[PDB]
Design a protein around this nucleic acid. Structure first.
Ligand SMILES: [Mg+2]
Length: 204
DNA sequence: CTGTATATTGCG
DNA sequence: TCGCAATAATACA
């Protein structure tokens, strides 16, 4: 397989296209048909002392007993469904890595987005890679170094930007998530939905 | 002079 | 349209 390697100080990621257009279309269609997203109380987070409905849709699937907590919200995983098992298994065969959990974020259009954060969970296994699989509209994905944020930053490490295309895989390897914040910024010109799956290895 | 951390507002 | 510092109120260590 041919990878585009994304390297910088404390940044170690790789990008590849897994599926051609026809297959990625079929997978996207099946995801749209089958994935059940959280609503209501399970779609609200607390950040900086205020509660917000998330500006997107979220779903969690994976092995029994696991939980996923961030920003005052705890999500329980739904049992695996065939479309998700298909992708999980393909990623595993391509990378040599295993996953027991997937977070699904759906961005209805360019106005849907996700703010800056690190995936520095306690429930995430130490040094475990994260596999980010994208379907639908291409969206720009942004890495920012932790020491380069704020009015008076410690460092001036350049922002790393990557478009994530339909049918693509972004592998985020250790120690990417200790040093770098990532986000999916608003892109007003994007009119079409995007579904992103982040496969992870969660501790019970 | 000085603790660390975290969705939209309010600019530019 | 885009980017980004400041910060909704606490919760730590
Ligand atoms: Mg993340």
């Amino acid at each position: 397989a041919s990878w585009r390697h994304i390297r910088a100080e404390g940044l170690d990621s790789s990008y590849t296209v897994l599926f051609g257009k026809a297959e990625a279309d079929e997978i996207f269609q099946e995801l749209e048909k089958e994935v059940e997203y959280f609503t209501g109380a399970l779609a609200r987070v607390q950040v900086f002392g205020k509660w917000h409905s998330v500006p997107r849709k979220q779903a969690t699937y994976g092995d029994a007993g696991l939980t996923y907590t961030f920003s005052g919200l705890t999500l329980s995983p739904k049992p695996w469904i065939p479309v998700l098992e298909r992708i999980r298994d393909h990623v595993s065969g391509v990378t040599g890595q295993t996953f027991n959990f997937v977070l699904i974020n759906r961005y209805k259009d360019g106005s849907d987005h996700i703010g800056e954060h690190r995936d520095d969970c306690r429930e995430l296994a130490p040094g475990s890679p994260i596999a980010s699989v994208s379907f639908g509209a291409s969206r720009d994905f942004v890495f920012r170094h932790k020491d380069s944020r704020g009015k008076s930053p410690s460092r001036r490490v350049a922002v790393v930007r990557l478009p994530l295309a339909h049918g693509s895989l972004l592998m985020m390897n250790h120690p990417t998530n200790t040093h770098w914040y990532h986000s999916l910024p608003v892109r007003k010109k994007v009119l079409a939905p995007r579904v992103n799956l982040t496969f992870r290895k969660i501790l019970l």
